[PDB]
Design a protein around this motif. Structure first.
Motif, PDB file in Angstrom:
ATOM      1  N   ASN A  77       1.289  13.402  13.999  1.00  0.00           N
ATOM      2  CA  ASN A  77       1.085  12.560  15.173  1.00  0.00           C
ATOM      3  C   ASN A  77       0.721  13.375  16.403  1.00  0.00           C
ATOM      4  O   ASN A  77       1.297  14.445  16.630  1.00  0.00           O
ATOM      5  N   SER A  78      -0.236  12.881  17.183  1.00  0.00           N
ATOM      6  CA  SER A  78      -0.579  13.516  18.459  1.00  0.00           C
ATOM      7  C   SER A  78      -0.439  12.561  19.640  1.00  0.00           C
ATOM      8  O   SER A  78      -0.783  12.906  20.770  1.00  0.00           O
ATOM      9  N   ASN A  79       0.060  11.357  19.374  1.00  0.00           N
ATOM     10  CA  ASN A  79       0.234  10.365  20.422  1.00  0.00           C
ATOM     11  C   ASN A  79       1.662  10.429  20.967  1.00  0.00           C
ATOM     12  O   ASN A  79       2.606  10.098  20.260  1.00  0.00           O
ATOM     13  N   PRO A  80       1.826  10.880  22.222  1.00  0.00           N
ATOM     14  CA  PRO A  80       3.179  11.016  22.782  1.00  0.00           C
ATOM     15  C   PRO A  80       3.988   9.720  22.724  1.00  0.00           C
ATOM     16  O   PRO A  80       5.214   9.755  22.649  1.00  0.00           O
ATOM     17  N   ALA A  81       3.304   8.582  22.756  1.00  0.00           N
ATOM     18  CA  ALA A  81       3.981   7.286  22.766  1.00  0.00           C
ATOM     19  C   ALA A  81       4.666   6.952  21.433  1.00  0.00           C
ATOM     20  O   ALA A  81       5.461   6.018  21.360  1.00  0.00           O
ATOM     21  N   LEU A  82       4.348   7.714  20.385  1.00  0.00           N
ATOM     22  CA  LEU A  82       4.885   7.463  19.047  1.00  0.00           C
ATOM     23  C   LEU A  82       5.942   8.471  18.611  1.00  0.00           C
ATOM     24  O   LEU A  82       6.588   8.275  17.587  1.00  0.00           O
ATOM     25  N   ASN A  83       6.142   9.534  19.383  1.00  0.00           N
ATOM     26  CA  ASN A  83       7.035  10.597  18.924  1.00  0.00           C
ATOM     27  C   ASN A  83       8.461  10.127  18.652  1.00  0.00           C
ATOM     28  O   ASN A  83       9.007  10.418  17.594  1.00  0.00           O
ATOM     29  N   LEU A 128       0.284  17.553  19.217  1.00  0.00           N
ATOM     30  CA  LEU A 128       1.068  16.748  20.152  1.00  0.00           C
ATOM     31  C   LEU A 128       1.361  17.499  21.446  1.00  0.00           C
ATOM     32  O   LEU A 128       1.997  18.556  21.435  1.00  0.00           O
ATOM     33  N   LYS A 129       0.911  16.938  22.563  1.00  0.00           N
ATOM     34  CA  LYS A 129       1.202  17.501  23.875  1.00  0.00           C
ATOM     35  C   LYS A 129       2.182  16.609  24.640  1.00  0.00           C
ATOM     36  O   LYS A 129       3.075  17.100  25.331  1.00  0.00           O
TER      37      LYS A 129
END
Ligand SMILES: [Ca+2]
Length: 237
Positions: free
Chosen positions: A116-122, A236-237
């Protein structure tokens, strides 16, 4: 005993065993069988003529047994269990079918979390991994049929067995343990994540497993595993 040679993907230096829960699974099965065997690594960027002749399809891992080549990790394991059998070699299959499924979904939950690279899903993805770990914990603390109505347990109704299926390593552990190993190494490095100490079944299981050389000595080093996941995990950032 016909010659037994396991061919596995080489790691970053083109020589050592590379990251792969599939390679390690089969390495563990062979070790636990007690058979004489060896492992040949394959640098997939520079395949030897010998390997190309044995396995033109290029699949890895593959098994050379006598002069016959077997591919597909699941099929290789099934073949090994069938051919390396009692009385000469120990049967490694689990007695309880659920042992063969418990915890396997952890690897998929991990893969989604780490790629995952979407911060909203971490947070959601971490919770999914945690939940799958909890389900494994529940399996490990649930008494198995062998333990029926016992009264020797420290905590009433809580299983204290060593491994998935009982007190011996089985094919089920050979599948799951290499996957759990990757999850631990990669999540600690790139997600600041460790399996909660509160998952005491999982932790007892891992402690018992790392105390066995069949598991510990078939793990690729932390650096190869971390390197294998660096690109996807750093997205992921
Ligand atoms: Ca954390």
């Amino acid at each position: 005993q016909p010659q037994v040679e396991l061919f596995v993907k080489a790691g970053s230096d083109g020589a050592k065993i590379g990251n792969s829960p599939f390679s390690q699974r089969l390495f563990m099965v062979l070790w636990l069988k007690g058979v004489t065997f060896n492992v040949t690594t394959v640098d997939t960027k520079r395949r030897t003529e010998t390997v190309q002749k044995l396995c033109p399809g290029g699949q890895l891992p593959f098994l050379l047994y006598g002069t016959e080549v077997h591919t597909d990790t699941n099929k290789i394991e099934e073949f090994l269990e069938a051919v390396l059998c009692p009385p000469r070699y120990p049967k490694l299959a689990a007695l309880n079918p659920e042992s063969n499924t418990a915890g396997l979904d952890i690897f998929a939950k991990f893969s989604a979390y780490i790629k995952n690279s979407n911060p909203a899903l971490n947070d959601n993805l971490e919770k999914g991994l945690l939940k799958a770990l909890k389900v494994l914990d529940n399996y490990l603390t649930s008494p198995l049929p062998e333990e029926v109505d016992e009264t020797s347990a420290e905590d009433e109704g809580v299983s204290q067995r060593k491994f998935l299926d009982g007190n011996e390593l089985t094919l089920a552990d050979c599948n799951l343990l290499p996957k759990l190993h990757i999850v631990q190494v990669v999540c600690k490095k790139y997600r600041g994540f460790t399996i909660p100490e509160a998952f005491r079944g999982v932790h007892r299981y891992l402690s018992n497993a790392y105390a066995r050389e069949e598991f510990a000595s078939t793990c690729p080093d932390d650096e190869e595993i971390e390197l294998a996941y660096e690109q996807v995990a750093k997205a992921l950032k």
